[PDB]
Design a protein around this nucleic acid. Sequence first.
RNA 1: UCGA
DNA 2: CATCCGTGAGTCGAGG
Lengths: 62, 687, 23, 224, 227, 717, 81
Amino acid sequence: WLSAASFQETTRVLTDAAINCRSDKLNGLKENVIIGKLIPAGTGINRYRNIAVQPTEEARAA
Amino acid sequence: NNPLSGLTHKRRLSALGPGGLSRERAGLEVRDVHPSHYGRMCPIETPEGPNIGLIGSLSVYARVNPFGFIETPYRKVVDGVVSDEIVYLTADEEDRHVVAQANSPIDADGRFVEPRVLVRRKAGEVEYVPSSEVDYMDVSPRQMVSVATAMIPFLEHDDANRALMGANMQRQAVPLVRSEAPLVGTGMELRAAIDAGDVVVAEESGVIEEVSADYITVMHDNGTRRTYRMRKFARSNHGTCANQCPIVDAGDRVEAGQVIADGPCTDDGEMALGKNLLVAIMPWEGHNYEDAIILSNRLVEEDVLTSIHIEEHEIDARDTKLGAEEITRDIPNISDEVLADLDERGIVRIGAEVRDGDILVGKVTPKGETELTPEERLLRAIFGEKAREVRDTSLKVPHGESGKVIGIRVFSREDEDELPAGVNELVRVYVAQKRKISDGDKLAGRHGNKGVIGKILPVEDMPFLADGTPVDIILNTHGVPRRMNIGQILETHLGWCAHSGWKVDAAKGVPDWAARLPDELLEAQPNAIVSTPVFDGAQEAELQGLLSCTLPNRDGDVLVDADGKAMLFDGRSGEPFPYPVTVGYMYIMKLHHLVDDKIHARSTGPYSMITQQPLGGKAQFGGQRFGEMECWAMQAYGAAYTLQELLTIKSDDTVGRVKVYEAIVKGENIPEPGIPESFKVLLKELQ
Amino acid sequence: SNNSVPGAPNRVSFAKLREPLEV
Amino acid sequence: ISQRPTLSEDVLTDNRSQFVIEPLEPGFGYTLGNSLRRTLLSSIPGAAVTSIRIDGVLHEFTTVPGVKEDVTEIILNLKSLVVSSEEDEPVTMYLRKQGPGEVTAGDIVPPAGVTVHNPGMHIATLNDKGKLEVELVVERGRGYVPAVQNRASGAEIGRIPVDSIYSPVLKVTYKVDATRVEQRTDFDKLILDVETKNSISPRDALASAGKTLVELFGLARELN
Amino acid sequence: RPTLSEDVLTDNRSQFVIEPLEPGFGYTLGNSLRRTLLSSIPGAAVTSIRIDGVLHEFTTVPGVKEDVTEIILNLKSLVVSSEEDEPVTMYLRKQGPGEVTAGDIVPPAGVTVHNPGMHIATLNDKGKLEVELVVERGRGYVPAVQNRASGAEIGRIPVDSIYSPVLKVTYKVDATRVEQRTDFDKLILDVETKNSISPRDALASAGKTLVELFGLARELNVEAEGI
Amino acid sequence: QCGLPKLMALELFKPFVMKRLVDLNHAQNIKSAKRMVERQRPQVWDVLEEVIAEHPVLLNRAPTLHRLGIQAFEPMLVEGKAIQLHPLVCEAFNADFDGDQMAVHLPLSAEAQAEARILMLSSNNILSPASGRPLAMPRLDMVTGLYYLTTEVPGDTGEYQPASGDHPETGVYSSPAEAIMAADRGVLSVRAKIKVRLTQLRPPVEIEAELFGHSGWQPGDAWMAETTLGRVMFNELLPLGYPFVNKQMHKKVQAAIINDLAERYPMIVVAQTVDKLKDAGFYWATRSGVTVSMADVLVPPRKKEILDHYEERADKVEKQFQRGALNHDERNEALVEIWKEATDEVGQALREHYPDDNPIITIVDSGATGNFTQTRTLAGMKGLVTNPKGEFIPRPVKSSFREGLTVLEYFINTHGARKGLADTALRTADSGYLTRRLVDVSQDVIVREHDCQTERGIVVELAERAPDGTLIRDPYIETSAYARTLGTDAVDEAGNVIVERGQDLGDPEIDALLAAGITQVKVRSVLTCATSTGVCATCYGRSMATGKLVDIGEAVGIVAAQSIGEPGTQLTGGLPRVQELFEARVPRGKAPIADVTGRVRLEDGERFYKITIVPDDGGEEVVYDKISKRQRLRVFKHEDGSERVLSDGDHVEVGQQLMEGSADPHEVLRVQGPREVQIHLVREVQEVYRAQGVSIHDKHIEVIVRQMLRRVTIIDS
Amino acid sequence: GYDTPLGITNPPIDELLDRVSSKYALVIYAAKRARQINDYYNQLGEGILEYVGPLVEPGLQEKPLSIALREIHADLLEHTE
RNA sequence: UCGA
DNA sequence: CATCCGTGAGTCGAGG
Ligand SMILES: [Mg+2]
Ligand SMILES: [Zn+2]
């Protein structure tokens, strides 16, 4: 409903959503931008987001 | 902005406003050019934006009848014979009649030349019609245009699109330190300057009794004396410089209706919206790519394109609940080095210089007696310095603003100066700037050939003619035939002929090309002024021939050919350019879109009261807007963090931005963004 | 000349003679 | 296939002089004279006014009672003032004139080492009751130095800094007669044209141009 | 601040860096120094040649792989320093199978060939080759039509004369930021020379040459300047 | 790089300089550090130069239509108060220099700078995401400059001459260094055809094999060529390792070179390569001698001759209507044709009368800028002006602009000119609107997986079979196939497979399938490949920007939207058609389609068109009712002749369009099915942008289309 | 084979991209190491056990990102998803 | 009202 | 297939 409200006919969107008790799972670009979360695209996805970088064992302090 | 700017604003025709229509309600039928507009409303002059076609200029010869319709003058033709008798006609009245074009050839008595002539008819339809059926004819060729439209030389050679901007931009020309008249004119430059009311016209005839920079006094014939006071260095509505100067010397016999002293953008009572520059039509090492403009340092070192700008800064001392604001020279925790340019009151002294961040009006207000910091209490006992209850609320110079303080206007409730309820001392400080033209300043001509200053080369770098004269301005060739505004080229050719002078060959008779050329022009002095009235004036034949008669320079050498071109030397390599470059003079107007005003930037600053977003506007030191369309560009790139940053810690995260600043100044790492306060607003607006 | 009415500088005009009425 | 040391002839005129240089390498003259032209117009030493001060005036934007012009136009006319000074350090000129009549560059009082070269220069038109007391400061520099630099130094509020066009050079050009005849008679003849501001001679201008350039190209001869 | 002189190297060519010049002097020094190195330095090259088994050009020389054209070109790239101004003559003869080089050339006294390993022409068996060369001194570049009468008209061939010991020179002018001023000019110069002289030397001669010219102007008064 | 003003930077890096100000003890604390900056003490300028070391910034330029409207740069300090911009990104921002203003945004967080330097750096985004074409290329003065030197001038001086008489071969140089010293003396022209031995440029592929046997050319190996000195200099920029090009550089030529460099050579080579070109063009644009005078703009010799011919043809038509033999709708319809033809003849007059030296033409015929239709307007005549209705005015503007239009001519031209600006302002609001809807429908569309693994794809008409024999490159090849990846092995007549499955289509791989004779390939599509959320990586294929496989996480949906909405301004069907399709409205045309395939039974009446169809396979006669204003579509029948209009007895396939107009996609759905209606939409959409010269790869359109059929209705609960 | 990469084009991105699965991954890869470096310098002053310092010679006033982006090219870092 |  | 009410109708900047 978030992505729907911020598009068009916002008053129509809300009246319907509040009656249906619609729960929004915050998984989408528009949805994530609004609440300020990392958008589920690009460097935002976990596949790239949770990266552990370490020096090679070969690389050692002088 | 300039005199013409005002005049045109008095003759605007707006469809907006109460009783009229809204912008959204206006379809495509209202805006475009209607057949009735001829001689009544200009078809060219109208804004470029979303206001297009809804704002129009009233045509030159038109006038308003007691019933609120637009009458236009037409010459009366009895029976094929033009009569000097003139009657004004309304739109619907004209339709019932049949009108001849103005340029239709006429006998020395008044009769037509050809039976069938060009004829204007109802519904904007045209057809050849026998002379027996000719009722009226147009007063003048330039009848359909407006005031600002008629100052565009060779208008009939420029497409409506660029001709449109041509008119709109002349109203944006900025008054220089001193003004030159255009080498090439249309004749309208005279009557416009006078009627503008921003020059000084003599009411009754007589002799200049005494002249000063301050005023001119005239002794009439009947004995009475009328003195005219000169407006000297006054701020306009748009921060330009309205300054008038006396033309006549003491003891000049002046007749009534004569300009005795002109103002901004006016030379000898003529509209002087710019300077006459030496142009060269060639691409130059890319520095003029995509409408950019290259300038000669001469233009800086001789103030050719220099203008004066005045700002008005204000502040007031009010009655507060903690006492009253008092303007004073004593400001808490400020050295005597900063206060140096102040008087005893707390005002800056006239003539002093001011930079941004400096102090103009020292004002202090009693701050709320809140418990000062236990950690600042502690700091005040060590150094034993007692805190003052007055907070610095002084008037400081806005960022970017600078120059000399050229006047102070103090109003005091104490001095019986009637102030609004609650104000004690009110100060005004006027600072003037002598802005030398620079990179990024928008330049333009009359043909809608706009452009910003790309680069200003040293005078020696400039491509120069044979006799060592460096050109002034280097326009790009590419951006000419695309715009269909080749009048700027015509002006340039006539520009060179008007600079070098000319002399047609009378031996073996008057040449056939210069047969329609009036006697007065068959011989021309160097730096002479001419008129090319719209839908009249110079024709392509006469122009080519004048290029053949271009008088040689002081060294007896001709400098350009009959093609109009000449051979230039690259001031950088020294070697001559391989091909002939077109060289001449073109009138260039400094437009009021200067970088010094337009440039802006902001680290942090103020914030929106509700949304906790930054404020907006250069006047508010506000941030830019990263709109919906810019968000997409981010997402499409897939730069989630940057996008997250911009819409969080850079915007409305109350706690976020603060810790960002701290992290930066401490040299640490940027923390993780929190919840947008803006979003919190929404959830409170939904509840 | 173009406008020989006020006492203005002489600006020479390529023209057909315009004498209907001044601006 | 020929070797001859080059000459440097001269054809004169009071304010401007043509220097002729030959015989030079083929297609060398153009880039040779330009090197001079870009030296003259830029870095030739001279002198002009830096700052001024007028009685009753605190800033550039006002009018002195009884004078036809305002300070701005007055300062603007003074841009065309031709001066030559020997004093390497700044000096102070003077101009005071009252009552009716015209004031000019001749009415300036140049101290020891300073000479005005155009006395007929129109400055202001003082009408009746009009008085004008001015104080002019002249320095030695080269090229062009904007007024704006003077004010931040510590100059008092009375002073009004003025732009400085030190370059005593007016207009410079050249032409080349390249004998391209198919033989070992192929050479280039250079004709340089220099015109000054009657502050220095065209010759002396070319001299200071050479002294400069010589000190520059000499660094290409020193060994590593 | 007085200017500096720098050098980045290669055996045959090198790049020179001049900075900081007074604003608007990079281009004042640029093109002028180039035309000097390419034209105002004296050397030696080939004016004309003569081949034994040639009565016209289109036919290749009896016993040679290369055409008449491709041998002239190879010879144009021959680097030679002659001591006397007056035209000298060197001979190059070789027969049998193998390859003729610049080390095979028989030079007069005071005349030195600086690239004896330069390929010239591939001869085969029963392949005879006798050539008469004409060497003069001059400056820069001289066309072949101007040398159409410098040999015996029994097979005299006019050649393009590349006297100049400097091969190719380019230059770029960037801006250095001195003090608060970013207006000062920095001059970068690229110079490639023959195997005859080092570029580092070619500039000093091209530099000393120009100092002489600007002497004429300076001689009159030596008024004012500061370094 | 970008020219970031000294005053602008100091406010952007304000707390970054304050950091280093209290560092180097220029200020005792953070408070004083602030005061130093605001007072602009002379110290900070030295400090700021350090702080902004390789610290990228963003240059935005509204309106931001596609993702190239915002690009990163390495900030360079500069005296002045204006942002300096690189000439090549002008095409991306759609930005001229008539007073444009660009926003600047400074990335702070560690990741932000990384997203700036890597993703959004201008030297990485050379190609358009919409077509894979190079946007950062020689554009104006650049192209004209290069087209200059690369032109072969026949009789120019220093030209190669064969040996004859007593003079040998003239115009043969040992090395490029020699020819350079020739033009400097003044013997050689930089545009004249000569022969030169080169040592640092690989010869053409055709000649290297002849001279080396593909022994692998080497820097030092010599060879002879027949070009101009200019063309040589240009090839030193490509530089080595690239086959020599001996042509004149039209824009279409240089476009290919970069595009080829885009494929093979890495990104940093292309970036540096394209930078060199800009320099060369500008330097030569200067000495190109391109100049506009009144002289170079010339009125045709047959000006009044040609116009008097048609004015005579017109007065005949006028008199033929004066007797009332001609209909009023016919009269103007003929007058339009008379003058439309006249203008063409005026255009022809110019091209021949104009020397190719003429800078007006030189610019036009070199792809630099400008249309010849403008040149016709300028020197020849304006032509037909448009009515408020849009129809072309019977009256023509016989005057060119050089001659000076008559008073009454200017007025009516002005009328059209303003309305042209009016609609130009309105479509932008319509285009931007369509764009924002397009974004919303396709936000959840992201590259989530590496591969769907379905074998489903869709057929691509690779090439048409030419009637006489051989074949013809289909006109949809570049937009429908070149970026796709195969979903089925492509075999010719033999058992020999040409291109495998799981293989990207490249330029040579198309030629391998084109010379093999196979004219139909099955390829993976966004439409076919089904993944849970969004789409997989394989089916989408080669990312138009990268020139390689799309990365896992690319927001292809929004990019697709931008790619469609960006050029949406240049339309006359027109733009409304695009909306009408994407909004799935029951079209204005409403052209019927055959429900069941069979034999066609035309039974036209003058009052009404009726069409009956006898089912091919038994069936019952199906009949439609049509209005006579529409007309039957010339469909390509079994006869292989498309120009055959619908006739009785003809054979139509199922769903075949009966008359001209547009078929209701909803009917196409119920009749031909889900897959078919997708393919109709894609190509009906494409047919709109084809007309106005716009090339969007079918990929982007499909993404949106896929998001339309994601739902099904509920018949029974 | 090319001309020397200048400024922010260095290290050349093509050779950078080869040591990573995609453009987007390279970003987080680099920055997360850049953070480690900047922590190291700030922690070092008062904190032991910091992330390991620059595995390459730091340029004078070289930005933390600019340091990290080089060692990636030097393959001295390990890559995990 | 103006600028792209 | 045609009416009545409700909902859309590009971006960014400037000023007073
Ligand atoms: Mg623009
Ligand atoms: Zn898939």
